[PDB]
Design a binder for this molecule. Structure first.
Ligand SMILES: *[C@@H]1O[C@H](CO)[C@@H](O[C@@H]2O[C@H](CO)[C@@H](O[C@@H]3O[C@H](CO)[C@@H](O)[C@H](O[C@H]4O[C@H](CO)[C@@H](O)[C@H](O)[C@@H]4O)[C@@H]3O)[C@H](O)[C@H]2NC(C)=O)[C@H](O)[C@H]1NC(C)=O
Ligand SMILES: *[C@@H]1O[C@H](CO)[C@@H](O[C@@H]2O[C@H](CO)[C@@H](O)[C@H](O)[C@H]2NC(C)=O)[C@H](O)[C@H]1NC(C)=O
Ligand SMILES: *[C@@H]1O[C@H](CO)[C@@H](O)[C@H](O)[C@H]1NC(C)=O
Ligand SMILES: *[C@@H]1O[C@H](CO)[C@@H](O)[C@H](O)[C@H]1NC(C)=O
Ligand SMILES: *[C@@H]1O[C@H](CO)[C@@H](O)[C@H](O)[C@H]1NC(C)=O
Ligand SMILES: *[C@@H]1O[C@H](CO)[C@@H](O)[C@H](O)[C@H]1NC(C)=O
Ligand SMILES: *[C@@H]1O[C@H](CO)[C@@H](O)[C@H](O)[C@H]1NC(C)=O
Ligand SMILES: *[C@@H]1O[C@H](CO)[C@@H](O)[C@H](O)[C@H]1NC(C)=O
Ligand SMILES: *[C@@H]1O[C@H](CO)[C@@H](O)[C@H](O)[C@H]1NC(C)=O
Ligand SMILES: *[C@@H]1O[C@H](CO)[C@@H](O)[C@H](O)[C@H]1NC(C)=O
Lengths: 98, 294, 327, 226, 142
């Protein structure tokens, strides 16, 4: 409720000892945000949909470094029967930058 | 030998600079006071104005484990007059050279039975244009099977020859004639790419770094920013599929006529392995002092 | 066996009477104002209360020891500070020009680190203690003014010129300092005659020894090394908290905001739990460590009180209690 | 990074002087950006310290900058029992801050005017008072202490110093001597703790409470309690 | 349970070491200024300690120290030594007291109270002639 609430909770008493006690300080609100960095061109995903997906002992990688991506154009056209993500949230993978 | 107190050829941190402070760093380093794998090139035989039979070593029959990548010191012998390999009494002005590297994982014996024939899909870096261009690729080599050719008869080794009376004129460059010279011994198939890079020419010492990591093959050069110092910053990250395990030098000589031969520099090769250093970054962000642990 | 020549030894001693008072909120350092973090902090709960009570009691005991020593070392009656004191004794380091000159030559040569007691936020707005949330704790201001410890030492400087002639704290007898020094030398077994013909000689030897300890403010002084050791002990204690934000204790990262940015709730609960368990254990160790430092400082404060009462407010006869040799 | 509708007020020059949240393409955080002369490697673009805290950044414009944090003030409280008198203090700060930029939960009302500057920072709930207290019970740090009235704001007195009776430095052969003309007996009550309450404890009744499977399971530890 | 036991054992060994050292301290304090009068400044009582009394306590020993505490200090005229005009060698100095020019002539008082009294032999000692003394002729002390 107030300062006195945590003061009373710190001693297990309604009647406390007077004194200059440190209290949990608060934080000024954020003033905004800045997103500034040079961004390159989108790294295309058409070779994934181009050609036969290979064998399990022959799986073909696609490296992506210093590029962009719009995930809206690919997952709605995938007939996904299993969407999992280990060590990460499966929804917000398109959100964060790497 | 390499000295870390003198701070010779230590790779920079990949993306994390500092200032005026020291920090531990686990990473890929060579040891202290290593002798290395220094080699040196030379020109071929010549009498007057005759490009004769070559003059190289048996590097092609030799191979070493790629290990954790390595570094090459380039230009340690320049700026001065030194001996001529083919003519030991003669000494000429030392001009620095830039060597070509072939790397892969599957090695067999040559057509004469000598060990060293690389198999399937391998990468070659090759400097051309009298040290200007840096043509590199990861494709399928094929040996030639003719006379004095790697898959053919009367064959000992192979080399990329350099014709300096034609190639090292002003401009010109004969459309990368050393790639043709390699192509006079080999050809190329099923090629992923043919990557092109530029550099300037100098008589100042420099380094080059090679390593492999799961994202790709990292190529490090100090020619981009630290011409006057020397410490390794990435410029290239090659999209490799797997991890290599063998390296060798493509031999290279010069079709230098005997009347106007030129001495050449001895480049040094130093393997790298995981160790831990301490780094003393100055205010500039440059590496001027580091120290070993092992 | 008799001495026939002599000198003055300026032995330098130091007592860490009082460690720097430190106050930290558990919630800020452990949590940094994250909502799910505050939600998860509830179960451990009273661990924060125990930490706060322990650190507050340790700080309070430190302040009580400070108060007891300073009231104790307070001369009930003293003398002001004038130039020309000591007259013959060049005692320029002693005289406070709002602090003392010897205090300046000490404190400035002490490798200190940017207090920022009023413009600390402005120091962060300018370009160690500018770290406040980065440090994560509050440095408690000292119990007095710096002017007040200067006043304490001023009262002491006035006191010692007069107390050292008569046993008993009943009165004050602030005789001119030269006669006091002469009678104190008469006490330890030096005849009045050699004092009477060699006042200038012993004055010059005194001045030379004071200059040597003055000019010796370097590595050659073990007391200088030890006060730097106490400063570095404070530095290491604060850096323990500072660098432990980097520790993930097995978590995938340290940035709790990035932790909740990347990872789902059910697993980041365990990750944050690991983080806060490591943090609370480190604060427990910190609390015990300053508890040991605090009782050490309390005993040291008592010892310093005894030394300033005995071999400072008097000329002690204990064999080398605070003077290497005789005092 | 994904496709992003880039905003005009997200440049570093666009938001100078007010601490905001940087999202440098996977390098996230918050803090205040300040103009700095160029330090370190230009091409690395990112510099940390020995404590692995990011210190500066080479902005794309060609101007170098530094950062510490979104620093705000620590907050503490003073309070007296049996007179419901409380006040709030902010350490080593200009009296900048009012109830606007908040976090955690709400505040407590007060019946006033707001701030007052002191050497330890800012104080809400006090007022100037030219009295001097030697025997303060709740010292507010440095040399200030609040005396509640014998009910509203307290009296922000300074810590008095018990300046002793100064004596005159006579230089002649005569002397000005201090002498007590009255006395008293002081009954100083001291105490020394000598020996704590001697205690013992059994292993098995304490840890086990006479349960048999527990009793076999205890011996694997066993000798620890012995 | 055993970790709590270990912590309790560690805490109580710390308390036991503290108790042993403080018991040595209490033994010392009842030795010096109780069975005698420790003249050291404020070991057991502020000012000069006068007397003390000792009682038990359910975990320790509790002390009462009655000590001297002065007030209403005034300023007087004092000196060090008196040497004769005819005999400047023979000089006297006070023993636990001061020579005070009384506001009734030089006189003696003790070092603890404004107690003027006529100077005699018992409260002073014969001392050497130092310089910066006083040198009277009209009424020499005995
Ligand atoms: C080989 O031949 C080359 C010419 O191709 C010759 O190069 C010269 O080297 C000197 C010595 O480094 C250079 O002088 C430099 O000048 C710049 C300003 O232009 C300075 O900043 C340099 O200082 C650097 O080096 C210091 C240590 O020595 C560092 O501490 C400092 O931070 C700087 O990094 C230095 O004074 C000169 O400019 C070049 N000349 C040319 C044309 O390149 C070289 O000396 C010959 N010998 C060897 C052994 O390489
Ligand atoms: C880099 O660190 C060095 C080492 O502390 C700093 O140099 C010191 O500066 C102080 C300030 O006058 C001197 O008292 C020391 O003698 C200096 N020591 C050395 C070894 O030079 C230097 O100022 C720092 N530079 C920056 C830009 O932070
Ligand atoms: C490697 O080269 C050998 C050479 O005959 C070939 O048999 C083999 O298939 C190659 N490996 C791959 C993965 O292509
Ligand atoms: C080269 O590529 C062609 C076309 O993809 C393929 O038919 C041929 O088998 C490849 N050759 C080798 C050696 O991989
Ligand atoms: C005593 O010794 C010091 C240094 O050894 C010397 O300077 C001084 O002159 C000596 N005094 C006498 C009286 O010999
Ligand atoms: C006293 O010491 C100070 C400190 O350096 C010096 O400046 C001054 O000249 C000295 N005076 C005498 C009389 O020795
Ligand atoms: C930062 O300060 C430097 C030094 O005066 C100045 O040259 C530069 O223009 C300033 N930065 C900006 C963005 O104006
Ligand atoms: C209180 O008032 C006095 C005189 O009016 C002034 O000197 C002092 O600075 C004031 N203090 C505060 C905290 O306002
Ligand atoms: C000393 O003070 C007490 C109380 O203040 C008083 O009763 C007593 O008469 C005083 N004695 C002298 C000698 O002043
Ligand atoms: C008078 O006092 C001075 C100061 O000590 C002393 O030197 C001198 O001998 C005294 N005169 C006599 C006659 O005692």
């Amino acid at each position: 409720f107030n300062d006195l609430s945590q003061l009373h909770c710190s001693y297990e008493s309604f009647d406390v000892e007077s004194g200059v006690y440190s209290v949990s300080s608060f934080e000024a609100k954020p003033s905004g945000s800045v997103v500034e960095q040079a961004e390159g061109v989108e790294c295309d995903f058409s070779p994934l949909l181009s050609g036969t997906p290979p064998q399990v002992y022959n799986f073909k990688r696609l490296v992506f470094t210093n590029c962009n991506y719009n995930l809206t154009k690919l997952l709605s056209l995938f007939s996904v029967n299993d969407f999992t993500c280990s060590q990460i949230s499966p929804a917000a993978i398109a959100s964060n930058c790497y | 030998p390499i000295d870390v107190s003198k701070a010779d050829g230590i790779i920079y941190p990949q993306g994390r600079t500092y200032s005026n402070i020291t920090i531990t760093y686990q990473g890929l380093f060579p040891y202290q006071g290593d002798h290395g794998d220094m080699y040196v090139y030379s020109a071929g035989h010549a009498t007057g104005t005759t490009p004769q039979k070559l003059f190289v070593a048996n590097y092609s029959q030799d191979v070493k484990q790629f290990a954790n990548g390595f570094v090459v010191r380039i230009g340690a012998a320049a700026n001065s007059t030194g001996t001529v390999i083919i003519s030991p009494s003669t000494s000429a002005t030392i001009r620095k050279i830039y060597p070509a590297f072939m790397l892969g994982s599957s090695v067999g014996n040559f057509s004469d039975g000598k060990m060293g024939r690389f198999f399937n899909h391998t990468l070659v870096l090759l400097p051309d244009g009298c040290g200007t261009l840096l043509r590199a690729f990861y494709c399928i080599l094929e040996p030639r099977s003719g006379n004095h050719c790697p898959a053919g008869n009367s064959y000992t080794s192979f080399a990329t020859y350099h014709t300096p009376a034609t190639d090292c004129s002003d401009g010109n460059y004969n459309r990368n004639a050393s790639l043709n010279s390699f192509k006079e011994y080999f050809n190329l198939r099923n090629c992923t790419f043919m990557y092109t890079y530029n550099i300037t020419e100098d008589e100042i010492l420099e380094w080059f770094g090679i390593t492999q990591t799961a994202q790709g093959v990292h190529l490090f050069s100090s020619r981009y920013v630290d011409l006057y110092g020397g410490n390794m910053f990435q410029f290239a990250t090659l999209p490799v599929y797997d991890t290599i395990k063998y390296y060798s030098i493509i031999p290279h000589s010069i079709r230098s006529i005997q009347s106007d031969r030129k001495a050449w520099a001895a480049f040094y090769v130093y393997k790298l392995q995981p160790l831990t250093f301490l780094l003393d970054f100055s205010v500039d962000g440059y590496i001027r002092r580091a120290i070993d642990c092992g | 066996s008799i001495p026939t020549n002599f000198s003055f030894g300026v032995t330098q001693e130091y007592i860490q009477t009082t460690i720097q008072k430190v106050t930290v909120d558990c919630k800020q350092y452990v949590c940094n104002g994250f909502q799910k973090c505050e939600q998860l902090l509830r179960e451990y709960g009273q661990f924060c209360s125990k930490i706060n009570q322990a650190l507050h009691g340790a700080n309070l005991r430190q302040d009580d020891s400070v108060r007891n020593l300073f009231a104790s070392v307070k001369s009930s009656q003293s003398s002001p500070i004038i130039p020309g004191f000591g007259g013959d004794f060049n005692l320029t380091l002693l005289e406070p020009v709002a602090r003392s000159a010897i205090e300046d030559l000490l404190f400035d040569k002490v490798t200190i680190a940017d207090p920022g007691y009023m413009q600390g936020y402005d120091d962060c707005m300018q370009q160690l203690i500018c770290a406040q949330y980065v440090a994560g704790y509050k440095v408690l201001p000292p119990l007095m003014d710096v002017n007040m410890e200067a006043a304490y030492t001023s009262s002491l400087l006035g006191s010692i010129a007069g107390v050292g002639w008569t046993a008993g704290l009943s009165s004050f007898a602030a005789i001119p300092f030269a006669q006091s020094i002469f009678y104190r030398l008469n006490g330890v077994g030096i005849t009045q005659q050699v004092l009477s013909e060699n006042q200038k000689l012993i004055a010059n030897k005194f001045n030379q020894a004071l200059g040597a300890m003055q000019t010796g403010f370097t590595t050659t002084n073990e007391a200088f090394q030890k006060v730097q050791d106490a400063v570095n002990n404070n530095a290491q204690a604060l850096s323990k908290l500072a660098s432990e934000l980097s520790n993930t204790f097995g978590a995938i990262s340290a940035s709790i905001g990035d932790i909740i940015q990347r990872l789902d709730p059910p697993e980041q609960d365990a990750q944050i739990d690991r983080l806060i368990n490591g943090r609370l254990t480190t604060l427990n160790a910190f609390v015990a460590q300053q508890l040991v430092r605090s009782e050490s400082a309390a005993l040291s404060a008592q010892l310093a009180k005894d030394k300033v009462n005995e071999c400072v407010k008097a000329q002690s006869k204990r064999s080398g209690f605070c003077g290497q040799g005789t005092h | 990074c994904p496709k992003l509708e880039f905003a005009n007020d997200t440049k570093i020059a666009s938001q100078l002087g007010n601490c905001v949240e940087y999202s440098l393409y996977g390098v996230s955080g918050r803090g205040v950006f300040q103009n700095c002369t160029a330090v370190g490697v230009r091409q690395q673009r990112f510099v940390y310290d020995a404590y692995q805290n990011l210190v500066g950044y080479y902005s794309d414009d060609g101007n170098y900058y530094c950062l510490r944090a979104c620093v705000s003030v620590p907050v503490s409280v003073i309070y007296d029992k049996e007179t419901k008198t409380h006040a709030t203090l902010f350490g080593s700060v200009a009296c900048e801050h009012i109830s606007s930029t908040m976090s955690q939960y709400s505040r407590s009302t007060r019946s006033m005017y707001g701030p007052l500057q002191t050497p330890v920072g800012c104080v809400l709930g006090l007022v100037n008072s030219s009295l001097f207290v030697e025997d303060c019970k709740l010292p507010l740090g440095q040399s200030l202490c609040a005396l509640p009235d014998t009910p509203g704001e307290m009296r922000l007195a300074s810590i008095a110093f018990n300046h002793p009776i100064q004596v005159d430095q006579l230089n002649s052969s005569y002397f000005k001597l201090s002498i007590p003309t009255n006395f008293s007996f002081g009954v100083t009550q001291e105490y020394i703790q000598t020996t704590i309450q001697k205690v013992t404890v059994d292993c098995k009744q304490y840890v086990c409470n006479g349960f048999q499977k527990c009793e076999q399971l205890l011996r694997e530890y066993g000798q620890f309690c012995s | 349970r055993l970790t709590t036991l270990n912590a309790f054992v560690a805490q109580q060994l710390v308390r036991s070491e503290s108790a042993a050292l403080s018991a040595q301290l209490a033994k010392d304090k009842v030795n010096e200024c109780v069975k005698a009068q420790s003249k050291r400044s404020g070991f057991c009582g502020q000012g000069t300690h006068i007397v003390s009394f000792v009682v038990n306590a359910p975990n320790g020993l509790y002390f009462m120290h009655v000590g001297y505490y002065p007030s209403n200090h005034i300023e007087v005229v004092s000196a060090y030594g008196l040497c004769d005009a005819a005999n400047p060698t023979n000089c006297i100095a006070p023993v636990n007291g001061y020579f005070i020019k009384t506001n009734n002539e030089w006189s003696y008082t003790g070092s603890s109270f404004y107690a003027p009294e006529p100077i005699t032999s018992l409260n002073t000692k014969y001392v050497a002639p130092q310089v910066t003394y006083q040198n009277i002729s009209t009424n020499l002390p005995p």
